[PDB]
Amino acid sequence: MNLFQTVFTGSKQALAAAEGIVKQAVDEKGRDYKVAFPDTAYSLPVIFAATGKKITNVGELEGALDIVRSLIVEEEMLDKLLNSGLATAVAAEIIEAAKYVLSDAPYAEPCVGFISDPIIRSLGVPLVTGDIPGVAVILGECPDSETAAKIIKDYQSKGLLTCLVGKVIDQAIEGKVKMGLDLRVIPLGYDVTSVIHVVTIAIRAALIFGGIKGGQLNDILKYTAERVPAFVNAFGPLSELVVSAGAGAIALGFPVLTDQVVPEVPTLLLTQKDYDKMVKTSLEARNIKIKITEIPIPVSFAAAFEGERIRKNDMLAEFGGNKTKAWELVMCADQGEVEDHKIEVIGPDIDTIDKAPGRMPLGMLIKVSGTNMQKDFEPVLERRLHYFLNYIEGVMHVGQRNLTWVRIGKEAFEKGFRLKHFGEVIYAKMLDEFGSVVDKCEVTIITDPGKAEELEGKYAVPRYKERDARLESLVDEKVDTFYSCNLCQSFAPAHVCIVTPERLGLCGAVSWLDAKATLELNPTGPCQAVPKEGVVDENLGIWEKVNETVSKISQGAVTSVTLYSILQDPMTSCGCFECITGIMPEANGVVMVNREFGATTPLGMTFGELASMTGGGVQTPGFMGHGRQFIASKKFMKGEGGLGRIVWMPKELKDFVAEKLNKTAKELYNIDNFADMICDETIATESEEVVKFLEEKGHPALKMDPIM
Amino acid sequence: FKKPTQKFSGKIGEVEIGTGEKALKLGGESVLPFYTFDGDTGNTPKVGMEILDVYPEDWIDPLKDIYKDVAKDPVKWAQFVEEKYSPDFICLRLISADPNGTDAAPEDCAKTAKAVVEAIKTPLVVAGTGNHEKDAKLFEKVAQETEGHNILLMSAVEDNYKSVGAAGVMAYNDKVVAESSVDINLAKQINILMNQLGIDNTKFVDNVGCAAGGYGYEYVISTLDRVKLAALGQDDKTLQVPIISPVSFEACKVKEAMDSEEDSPQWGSQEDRTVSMEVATASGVLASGTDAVILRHPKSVEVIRNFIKELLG
Amino acid sequence: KEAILNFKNRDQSKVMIPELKCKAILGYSVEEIINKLDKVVNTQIGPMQTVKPLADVLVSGVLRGAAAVVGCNNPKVVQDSAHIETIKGLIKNDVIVVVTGCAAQAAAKYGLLQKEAAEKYAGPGLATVCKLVDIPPVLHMGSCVDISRILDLVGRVANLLGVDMSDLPVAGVAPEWMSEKAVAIGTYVVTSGIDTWLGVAPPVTGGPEVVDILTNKMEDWVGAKFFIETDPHKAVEQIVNRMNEKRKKLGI
Numbered sequence A: 001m002n003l004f005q006t007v008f009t010g011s012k013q014a015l016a017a018a019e020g021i022v023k024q025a026v027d028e029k030g031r032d033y034k035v036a037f038p039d040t041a042y043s044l045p046v047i048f049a050a051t052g053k054k055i056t057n058v059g060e061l062e063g064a065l066d067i068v069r070s071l072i073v074e075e076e077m078l079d080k081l082l083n084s085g086l087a088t089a090v091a092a093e094i095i096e097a098a099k100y101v102l103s104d105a106p107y108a109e110p111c112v113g114f115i116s117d118p119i120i121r122s123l124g125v126p127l128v129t130g131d132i133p134g135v136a137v138i139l140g141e142c143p144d145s146e147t148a149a150k151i152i153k154d155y156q157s158k159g160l161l162t163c164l165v166g167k168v169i170d171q172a173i174e175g176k177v178k179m180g181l182d183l184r185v186i187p188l189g190y191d192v193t194s195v196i197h198v199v200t201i202a203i204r205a206a207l208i209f210g211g212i213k214g215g216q217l218n219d220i221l222k223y224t225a226e227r228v229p230a231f232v233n234a235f236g237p238l239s240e241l242v243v244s245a246g247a248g249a250i251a252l253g254f255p256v257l258t259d260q261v262v263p264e265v266p267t268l269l270l271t272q273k274d275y276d277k278m279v280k281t282s283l284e285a286r287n288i289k290i291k292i293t294e295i296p297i298p299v300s301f302a303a304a305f306e307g308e309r310i311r312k313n314d315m316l317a318e319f320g321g322n323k324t325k326a327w328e329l330v331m332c333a334d335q336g337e338v339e340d341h342k343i344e345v346i347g348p349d350i351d352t353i354d355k356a357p358g359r360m361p362l363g364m365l366i367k368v369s370g371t372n373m374q375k376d377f378e379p380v381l382e383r384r385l386h387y388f389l390n391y392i393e394g395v396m397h398v399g400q401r402n403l404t405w406v407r408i409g410k411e412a413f414e415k416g417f418r419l420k421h422f423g424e425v426i427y428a429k430m431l432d433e434f435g436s437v438v439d440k441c442e443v444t445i446i447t448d449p450g451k452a453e454e455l456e457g458k459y460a461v462p463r464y465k466e467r468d469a470r471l472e473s474l475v476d477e478k479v480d481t482f483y484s485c486n487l488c489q490s491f492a493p494a495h496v497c498i499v500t501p502e503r504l505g506l507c508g509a510v511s512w513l514d515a516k517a518t519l520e521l522n523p524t525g526p527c528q529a530v531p532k533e534g535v536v537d538e539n540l541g542i543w544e545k546v547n548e549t550v551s552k553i554s555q556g557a558v559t560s561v562t563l564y565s566i567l568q569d570p571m572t573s574c575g576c577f578e579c580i581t582g583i584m585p586e587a588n589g590v591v592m593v594n595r596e597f598g599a600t601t602p603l604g605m606t607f608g609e610l611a612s613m614t615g616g617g618v619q620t621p622g623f624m625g626h627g628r629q630f631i632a633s634k635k636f637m638k639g640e641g642g643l644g645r646i647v648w649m650p651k652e653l654k655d656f657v658a659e660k661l662n663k664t665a666k667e668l669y670n671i672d673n674f675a676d677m678i679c680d681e682t683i684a685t686e687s688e689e690v691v692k693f694l695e696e697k698g699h700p701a702l703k704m705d706p707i708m
Numbered sequence B: 001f002k003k004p005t006q007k008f009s010g011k012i013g014e015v016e017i018g019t020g021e022k023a024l025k026l027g028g029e030s031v032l033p034f035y036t037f038d039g040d041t042g043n044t045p046k047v048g049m050e051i052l053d054v055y056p057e058d059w060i061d062p063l064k065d066i067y068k069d070v071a072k073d074p075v076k077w078a079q080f081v082e083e084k085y086s087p088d089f090i091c092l093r094l095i096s097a098d099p100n101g102t103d104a105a106p107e108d109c110a111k112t113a114k115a116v117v118e119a120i121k122t123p124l125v126v127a128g129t130g131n132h133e134k135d136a137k138l139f140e141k142v143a144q145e146t147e148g149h150n151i152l153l154m155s156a157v158e159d160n161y162k163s164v165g166a167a168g169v170m171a172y173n174d175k176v177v178a179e180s181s182v183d184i185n186l187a188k189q190i191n192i193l194m195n196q197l198g199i200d201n202t203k204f205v206d207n208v209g210c211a212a213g214g215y216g217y218e219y220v221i222s223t224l225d226r227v228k229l230a231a232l233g234q235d236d237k238t239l240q241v242p243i244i245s246p247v248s249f250e251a252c253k254v255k256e257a258m259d260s261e262e263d264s265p266q267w268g269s270q271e272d273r274t275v276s277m278e279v280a281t282a283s284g285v286l287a288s289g290t291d292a293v294i295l296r297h298p299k300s301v302e303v304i305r306n307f308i309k310e311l312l313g
Numbered sequence C: 001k002e003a004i005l006n007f008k009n010r011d012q013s014k015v016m017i018p019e020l021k022c023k024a025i026l027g028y029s030v031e032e033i034i035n036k037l038d039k040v041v042n043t044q045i046g047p048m049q050t051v052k053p054l055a056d057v058l059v060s061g062v063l064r065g066a067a068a069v070v071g072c073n074n075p076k077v078v079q080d081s082a083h084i085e086t087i088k089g090l091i092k093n094d095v096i097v098v099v100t101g102c103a104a105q106a107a108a109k110y111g112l113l114q115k116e117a118a119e120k121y122a123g124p125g126l127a128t129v130c131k132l133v134d135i136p137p138v139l140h141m142g143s144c145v146d147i148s149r150i151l152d153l154v155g156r157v158a159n160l161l162g163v164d165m166s167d168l169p170v171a172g173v174a175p176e177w178m179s180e181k182a183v184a185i186g187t188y189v190v191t192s193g194i195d196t197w198l199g200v201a202p203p204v205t206g207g208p209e210v211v212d213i214l215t216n217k218m219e220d221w222v223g224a225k226f227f228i229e230t231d232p233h234k235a236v237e238q239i240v241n242r243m244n245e246k247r248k249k250l251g252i
């Protein structure tokens, strides 16, 4: 008997039991006798959910058997199997409804039977806020009472609401599990049909919290699959009826886990014989994450302890700097190579220190695995490491990559701080802040002189080089999605930043990769995706989708923008920029001013006047604000010819940018030493003097087409 | 000349608060506030009065003289306010649950809220403290206890937006206030978070921030202008919910309002300055696009009601 | 360089390129398929890097079977008609399809090599499988020599289930074959234990004994046999019936 035939057989047995018990209700109470569940507004929830009909008398309960019959179509296709599972759920509900008709109180304690609506509203709020991570539906019998008690109390200690059906109720009592609604251990009943009492909880969750009307079965099934984190643990031998009821749980999107050999279906029906891993298997199968409320460390962890520098007198241990070599790395790896909450230390700890301030290499290696995690997100998490270590009093971390510079105070040594607490804090904060993309985290602390250097060579430097190469080689043509940021709309209401691989956010801190990471980690945030659709002018940088997104985000203040041109429909500026590019028509070029440059320019206005003229989210042709990195870009003023228009620049800015500016000018059409031809404040700050220097220096801006 | 007749493609949604014949509707306007020449204003702005569970020790002496015999009992205070001034709604602020000041279990505040709500027919607005952690539990208990009256829960900020959303709209069929701070984008974010949770635009109102006149008032004015223009001009669906501004929370705690005449002899009557501050703040925010205001002094309530009546009619 | 220099001889007045192109996803080697299947593996259970998830979906009946669509075009058949009709029928019947060669290219042109195709053409079980594994319902496994990959895949499944390849609900189809290579392919696929449907009759109708050997007696030797069916809808029906028969033999 295959899976489909087992489910069909179970549904028919459920139908046979429903018909028999309905016949008893008709013979003893008549078709006019009332049918109801204690304290509910949804009548029989499963039938109300599936059909929208409320059943009030016994005669209608007998007419509900046709719903079960119409749901059993014996054709071996997945949809029929799910419908047959729902047939068992409807039949089980009819059996439970007839129980209340036949006997006034059909459940005796500890069994609670039906769960009233006020209880659902009572536990509904923890279900939405995640205070209840999931619902563990445990039915059947474990090999021994202690095995059941261990699994049940494991779910209970994790905050999950566990419901019990069958002999596990007695096994848990023998195992001394404290059962209650406040204790989140609810025994429903000894019969298999009592599992419908937790099914109606998920059904009424859609009815009450999802606001889905009765009869919208597909919407209700969609709701329970996405919103109700329920799963089934079926222990002991499974009859056909149990399997068909499990098909009902699968029909609601609840995966079924069992210790029995079954025809496994990936993500839906799974066999796990190891009772020591059943809880972890179920949490993974239902995508349930338990929040570590506290970091198991003796030293205090808080944000208020950031920036408290400990001096040489307070210091015990020191890592990195010129004293020795230290490095940190966050790398993405497959789930097999990472172990959850695996904190190991290679080499000696700080307890072996002579009690004098000592030097020893420190290698920090954090492997992170997840479904949504990719390599481009590795640097972002790594930056947060700087903060995660700084929130611990007694330790301070500054620097990045192999420039790690860490100090640990003597007071941390007294309180009981060791190198394992580094890993504990890192794991806790990685799972807290980055729970969206990080599923498993492994932290490794290395202190050996040899192993630290071997791991730095094997892992750290190749990833640093590949990150630098990816930052260098990314261009607007390869990608097909830019990113819009509106963070600076709090003071520039019409300003929208468009971030491309070659055009940074003009604040200088938001990049294309940073924007992608923000969009992934923080939806409904400052950064949103802008598809590259409706290209109009690739030389100028005009897309129909870009104009549409700019019009939407700026609330209609700015309608059409141009990414690569300064004079035709330019981008707006907010006020966080460090550099301002303005047009100089007499030199047939553009001058550049920096925030730190307080003197005058060839253009006349100083930076403050240029900042007042340019910023504020207003499209001002001929002027723009940007960072220091956009100067040496390929797309810098691409619409007006390129960066050959740069004719004046402060000496400090020129000295900072000269290497990449010369590289890009050498690619453009010019001798490498393009920095020397650009004027500066030392040579001349005046119109005619700058023009004379440019024309005597053979500046390319004097040989191009007129800029306006 | 040609009459200026720019049309709007958006319309503010309507939210109903309370039960019975006293239930009030907020929103529905298709034009700017009081622009009866441009089109229709869906509902008249509503004015509510503020009461506390504990005795208002920090309030000015004239206000303690007005409520000298009822301020001890929140139920008597609410009944007195309803019988004497008949506001559109009553705001019951649970300041006894503030963790920084006197701290109370959520059960006691929920009991007080239930006692108040089962004695009045006017819609009730239950406002918590500024602490999000306290607010989540407090509003869960209050919404459980005060079930069936369609109350409004204030300050469902992002940090607890789920909890107040779940214990409020979803579970006990109440309304909620999504609160942000002087930012249109944060208001959009909180509205989108409420919508994704499963809560429609007909189930909550917005609080884009409130301030007294002279203390960051221009930021509130600009935020109100921006959200109104985006909701109506741009047909921004995520900003088309009504806005409630608690005026007496901030306008009555400033030096100009709260200084006694003996403290500043040149300023004059303390009650007049308090009423003037309340009226000015409420008038400005009403002109900028707020739909409901919470006022403390009954004279301010009367003046603002007459102001609304004169402008709309 | 010779090809590039010929661009100067282009006559742009004689150029007509139809604006008809279709997006396709391919690259499904056995290794790539195993990597994709690793997503639906519970980490606490395992094992990883096996064909076990595919074997599980086949045994449970969520997928009725797997069918390989291979072969050329042939002027005797409306070009690409039989390929497309056979593939759509199979995936509608919750049969996952692997394609090679000109059949794979017909699927690519039509638009079947797309994730969206799962919700447009596949039946419920195959649509669920495609959503869970994030694959198109039709997997392009490469060229005509890459049919060996298909053998490899089937063999692995058989070795995981402890049965011969003739016990599995698998089949091969050559809706529009023309080449001697196609004849050799069908012969070794049948000899390996996989029933093969031919959409073009091979020149054997003149020998009654040869027809009887290829379509009847072959099953006694290697557990599979040839099916000659020029109607694609009838071929899909026969493939589904034969797969169900082999499932009932296997107990799944």
Ligand code: SF4
Residues within 6 Å of the ligand: A485, A486, A487, A488, A489, A496, A497, A505, A506, A507, A508, A509, A510, A526, A574, A576
């Ligand atoms: S300047 Fe930077 S922070 Fe401001 S909107 Fe642009 S990307 Fe965002």
Ligand code: NI
Residues within 6 Å of the ligand: A488, A506, A507, A574, A575, A576, A577
């Ligand atoms: Ni900015």
Ligand code: NI
Residues within 6 Å of the ligand: A488, A507, A573, A574, A575, A576, A577, A615
């Ligand atoms: Ni700026």
